[PDB]
Design an enzyme around this catalytic site. Structure first.
Site, mmCIF file in Angstrom:
data_model
loop_
_atom_site.group_PDB
_atom_site.id
_atom_site.type_symbol
_atom_site.label_atom_id
_atom_site.label_comp_id
_atom_site.label_asym_id
_atom_site.label_seq_id
_atom_site.Cartn_x
_atom_site.Cartn_y
_atom_site.Cartn_z
ATOM 1 N N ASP A 194 0.818 -1.217 0.000
ATOM 2 C CA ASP A 194 0.000 0.000 0.000
ATOM 3 C C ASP A 194 0.849 1.263 0.000
ATOM 4 O OD1 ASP A 194 -2.382 1.644 0.018
ATOM 5 O OD2 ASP A 194 -2.881 1.157 2.105
ATOM 6 N N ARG A 249 -0.281 9.118 1.161
ATOM 7 C CA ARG A 249 -1.081 9.090 2.411
ATOM 8 C C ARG A 249 -0.408 8.165 3.464
ATOM 9 N NH1 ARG A 249 -3.894 6.079 -1.338
ATOM 10 N NH2 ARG A 249 -3.632 3.837 -0.997
ATOM 11 N N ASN A 250 0.477 7.243 3.031
ATOM 12 C CA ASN A 250 1.155 6.325 3.949
ATOM 13 C C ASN A 250 2.587 6.764 4.285
ATOM 14 O OD1 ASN A 250 -1.060 4.622 4.536
ATOM 15 N ND2 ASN A 250 -0.752 3.428 2.730
ATOM 16 N N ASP A 304 2.579 3.998 7.788
ATOM 17 C CA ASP A 304 1.606 2.888 7.752
ATOM 18 C C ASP A 304 1.969 1.904 6.653
ATOM 19 O OD1 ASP A 304 -2.117 3.142 8.091
ATOM 20 O OD2 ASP A 304 -0.677 1.625 8.813
HETATM 21 C C1 69C Z 1 0.684 15.932 12.542
HETATM 22 S S1 69C Z 1 -0.723 14.995 11.929
HETATM 23 C C2 69C Z 1 -0.258 13.308 12.075
HETATM 24 S S2 69C Z 1 1.315 12.885 12.709
HETATM 25 C C3 69C Z 1 0.966 11.194 12.651
HETATM 26 C C4 69C Z 1 2.035 10.268 13.023
HETATM 27 C C5 69C Z 1 2.053 8.822 12.962
HETATM 28 C C6 69C Z 1 3.299 8.446 13.387
HETATM 29 N N1 69C Z 1 3.976 9.561 13.681
HETATM 30 N N2 69C Z 1 3.233 10.672 13.471
HETATM 31 C C7 69C Z 1 -0.303 10.949 12.174
HETATM 32 C C8 69C Z 1 -1.008 12.174 11.818
HETATM 33 C C9 69C Z 1 -2.241 12.152 11.046
HETATM 34 O O1 69C Z 1 -2.684 13.103 10.400
HETATM 35 N N3 69C Z 1 -2.848 10.941 11.051
HETATM 36 C C10 69C Z 1 -2.482 9.754 11.837
HETATM 37 C C11 69C Z 1 -3.150 8.492 11.324
HETATM 38 C C12 69C Z 1 -4.327 8.037 11.910
HETATM 39 C C13 69C Z 1 -4.862 6.804 11.563
HETATM 40 C C14 69C Z 1 -4.232 6.014 10.620
HETATM 41 C C15 69C Z 1 -3.080 6.469 10.005
HETATM 42 C C16 69C Z 1 -2.545 7.704 10.348
HETATM 43 C C17 69C Z 1 -0.967 9.609 11.986
#
Ligand code: 69C
Ligand code: CL
Length: 270
Positions: free
Chosen positions: A133, A137-138, A151
């Protein structure tokens, strides 16, 4: 093995998106991203194993109480898709008053983002690990344009990027993956080419003019995404190398990375 963290040391601040992911402070003060779920043990051991400069850092788990927790480094500038869209041609309109030098990312910055995602994919391919994937977005962005693969499969605000057959990111997939669910390092290199197209269009969705069934027909028929306006011809030639119809004819991620690094180096002083 897997590092364990005491629940007392994790102080939640707020939620980041949806399994819930929160921003928190960790002791032994430090900012972190915490994943809480409603297969965990397998993932913990996997994330402890995957160690690289362009893979989001995993700190450990919290296996005391409910829910079970996964601790990651905090990436301030969020997901690469959102970062691209907010640092694109309409950045001045979208920017807040205090934002530093608002405007679209330049060639050098777009090449440095692409090269860092490629470096992360070189590491994974060397370990015979198939992502399945890969998409902006990942990927995650930290301060100083540091880009890391996050992710491994999204945040639900990207549900439009998946087709139900078991959700498949069909727009990033080659024909053998759409038709037969054949996932390999060669289908990941195809997805990398689509990541290059997302980067050079500042986060546009691939085949945005088309519905899921129209995108499936176009991809399986061999249609190629048009060259982005901000894409130099030599970057498009790299995309085409990732998009060869036969999986074995596709360029290796190592050569793609070397070519992007060579283009980034030649543009550094200009
Ligand atoms: C500063 S915004 C930010 S920092 C961050 C992250 C993850 C590891 N380090 N930092 C995430 C996010 C975001 O916008 N979404 C979050 C997400 C939620 C569910 C699934 C996948 C991603 C993950
Ligand atoms: Cl070409």
């Amino acid at each position: 093995c897997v590092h364990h963290i005491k629940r007392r040391d994790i102080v939640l601040k707020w939620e980041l998106g949806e399994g819930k992911v929160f921003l928190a402070e960790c002791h032994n003060k430090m900012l972190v991203a915490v994943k809480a779920l409603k297969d965990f043990q397998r993932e913990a051991e996997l994330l402890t194993m995957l160690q690289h400069q362009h893979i989001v850092r995993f700190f450990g788990v919290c296996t005391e109480g409910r829910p079970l927790l996964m601790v990651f480094e905090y990436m301030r500038h969020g997901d690469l898709n959102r970062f691209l869209r907010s640092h694109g041609p309409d950045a001045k309109l979208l920017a807040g008053g205090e934002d530093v030098a608002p405007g679209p990312l330049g060639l050098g910055q777009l090449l440095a983002v692409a090269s860092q995602v490629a470096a992360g994919m070189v590491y994974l391919a060397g370990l015979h690990f198939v992502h399945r994937d890969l998409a902006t977005r990942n990927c995650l962005v930290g301060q100083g344009l540091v880009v890391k693969i996050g992710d491994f499969g999204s945040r639900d605000i990207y549900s439009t990027d998946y087709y139900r057959v078991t959700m498949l990111p069909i727009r990033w997939m080659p024909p053998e993956s759409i038709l037969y669910r054949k996932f390999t390092t060669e289908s990941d290199v195809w997805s990398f080419g689509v990541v290059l197209w997302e980067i050079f269009t500042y986060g546009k969705q691939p085949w945005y003019q088309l519905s899921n069934t129209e995108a499936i027909d176009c991809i399986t028929q061999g249609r190629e995404l048009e060259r982005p306006r901000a894409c130099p011809p030599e970057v498009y030639a790299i995309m085409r190398g990732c998009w060869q119809r036969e999986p074995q004819q596709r360029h290796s991620i190592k050569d793609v990375h070397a070519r992007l690094q060579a283009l980034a180096q030649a543009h550094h002083h200009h």
